[PDB]
Amino acid sequence: KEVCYGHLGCFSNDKPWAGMLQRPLKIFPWSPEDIDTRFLLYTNENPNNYQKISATEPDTIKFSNFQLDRKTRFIVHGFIDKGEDGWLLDMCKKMFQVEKVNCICVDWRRGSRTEYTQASYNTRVVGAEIAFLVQVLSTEMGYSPENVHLIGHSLGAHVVGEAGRRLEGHVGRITGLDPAEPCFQGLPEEVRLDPSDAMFVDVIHTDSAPIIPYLGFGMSQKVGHLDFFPNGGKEMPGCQKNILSTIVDINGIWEGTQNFVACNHLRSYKYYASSILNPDGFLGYPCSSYEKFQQNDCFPCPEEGCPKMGHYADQFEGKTATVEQTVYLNTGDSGNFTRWRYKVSVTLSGAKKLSGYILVALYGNNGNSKQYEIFKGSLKPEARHVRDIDVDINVGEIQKVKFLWNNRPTLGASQITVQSGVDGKEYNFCSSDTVREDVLQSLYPC
Template sequence: MSVAKILCCLLLTCHLSEGKKLKGNRTVVDTEQRRVLKVKQPYVSSSIFRLFLEGEDTCTVDPLQLHTLTSCGFNSSNPLIIITHGWSVNGMMSSWVFRLARALKANLIDVNVVVTDWLSLAHQHYPIAVQSARTVGKDIAHLLQSLQAQYQYPVRKAHLIGFSLGAHTSGFAGSYLGGSEKIGRITGLDPAGPLFEGMSPTDRLSPDDAEFVDVIHTFTHERMGFSVGIKQAVAHYDFYPNGGDFQPGCDLQNIYEHVAQYGLIGFEQTVKCSHERSVNLFIDSLLNKDKQSVAYRCSDNSAFDKGVCLDCRKNRCNTLGYNIKKVCVGTSKRLYLRTRSRMPYKLYHYQLRIQFINQTETIEPSLTISLAGTKEESREIHITFTEMIAVNRTYTFLITLDRDLGDLMLLKLRWEGSNLWKNMWNRVQTIIPWGGWKRKPLLTVGKISVKAGETQERTCFCAMENDVQHVEVLQDKVFVRCKEETTKPCRRRHS
């Protein structure tokens, strides 16, 4: 286990001994808490709401004196976004809050951005902060109802964005609000796992809390019986970048890069790198509108790795982040994608399907391919088989590239063979230089097709020569885009 993971686990474990007791003795929330809040009754908020202006400047809003909203520059004609932080170890506002607020204001322009400051409650032992999350949810609900009463502001124009424990807090706000009108959208950024995993929908963020709920899971790697982020699907659309358990660029080996970027707090950044990647992915969707990351519905990460899930029919794919397509769905949808280790995070997904006519019995197959399109050429991509190649069987692989190749035109394939085979062939060539073996073993390739996930275009490839599509060991074989008449069966089968 890496030092980063150990520290992260110990940090939460020291606060969870008390939490396990709470989880075992959890009682149903009393009916008084479940009642719709009455705006007319005096209500003292435990949270501080700050209307974001610019930079790190904010203007404090008093829910009991809503004229402070006007003086702070609140515009009731514009949508409202409420950012809610999570559990705080040091009692200070995390820098990501202002980075997200700035990205929202700069790219959406006509929007009210409010930051929920509940540091006094969040800077407690984790189980106590979990209990306080309900109180903060009630505070947010009261603010929305006050806006509804004072400004006739529809709560469907509100978008709550909560990170970690703040995600469940946003969910509690939606459940406390009650009434026929729901909050328009709740986005959960890696909702907290401890004391929420496996709980009923009323005790965590759930699809019932808003008209539309989306969640990005980035740190569900389980250690010591729990994970920092919740594993289970808790939204209409649950995104699992890179499987959702750990993120590229967040290993201990990246600590030097983090120290160079963040200074002395670089080690802390390494520890919470995967957890806060959910925030950075959301910010990325605002800053890089021309590079929106697309995710695909799949049963699990293992199936996605095999490249069988790049389908967009019937809302099987969606955009990760702010610009998600808010499609009404009955049950939670799990979507998967791969990302880069830094911004812009977008990767282009391709599905490779390749059929072999013959079989390899004793040689482990290993292929290298490269693709060329109308825009770019790809690097060499290594394709490794986990089993021997069988007769007349089609294999599917997931390929990800950091650039859009355009319309695919050419595919180059090389059969690497195994190191054992290479050494054996070189020795045979040395001993029998005149060719004791008439020719090297051959792989006979049948159909080859590549499907671009982002465009849903499938391209079939044929050998350049008019011969059977044989591939020798260590030989570069070039395949070109098939002529239109030869691609119809391929397209009809896989479209």
């Protein structure tokens, strides 16, 4: 059957829209009136107070500060944790710091603040609302959908995915921030976010552990041209893991009646926010798997460069070469979350075989790093060891490195190579010395 809502078309309840394993209930999405989608426009000139725009009343747009010669980015919410109500506008403000943009925050709280399955179905109508506004801008004002970027978090990722399908995949870009798993993962492409929804789709996965039994609200399934899995995509540094327990009560979670640490689910947008100002701190390395990446493979950046996770992912050369490209990287646990990966190779030197740990610190014109463990076990002179480390600072031009070992024997590194990921640049350092344990050995350019 289907309910029709005027200019937003009809909404069917048969397969695959409803009556499926992931969504058995055959109810219909609420009316546009009951969802009350609100398009709140903010621009560099009006960053504090919004200008409500309506596709059905074109004058709201004509009289607004919407600039036809600027890109447009829609930001759509989903799960809203206590105190995070203002994350959409916060995101717009960060964008304002680096670009001129029409930032439209999509508020559909009346439609989302209800039982989960209902909210999930309501995404269809919010998606139709977005598609219609984009269609008005395009057909009536000559503003191409190519200038439009739809950012959707949680349930909002499927809202934007629906908008894209309606636009026949012509919207410029869609960014899915930890797309909601319950009621979407495993279903046909027509009912969820997928690569065909936009000319370019990038996804950040941050809470991809199964909702049952792990309480991971995000999708593990790949749904973009680029699918980023920072820190593995299931557990983020700095976030308390959720207690492994009985079905969820996916609705109790959604509606705040059940305990749930939303930290991992929200990290997706937290990383996006930071990537706006610090994209160089989020270089992503395409790789067949996270374990492979963690085993020091898929480094340095490939010939096409590394896609920068977040805001600047659209700059990636191979962004649409294929779909479901897995991209990995690790982040910090707080603040900017930025990291700079370096492949460190150490060739040991000395007269005695020892047992212990070897560490290396990097020194550059931008500053120096802390010491990082490269290897632990038997330390044999002339043996070479390699480890890719995620440093919390960009040292810039590496001018020297320091070697340190621990558990009056002496040990040293005759040569250490440090390769930066961005361009594969190898810096070599050399020394003919050896030091006692817990003493820093400096190695200079060679």
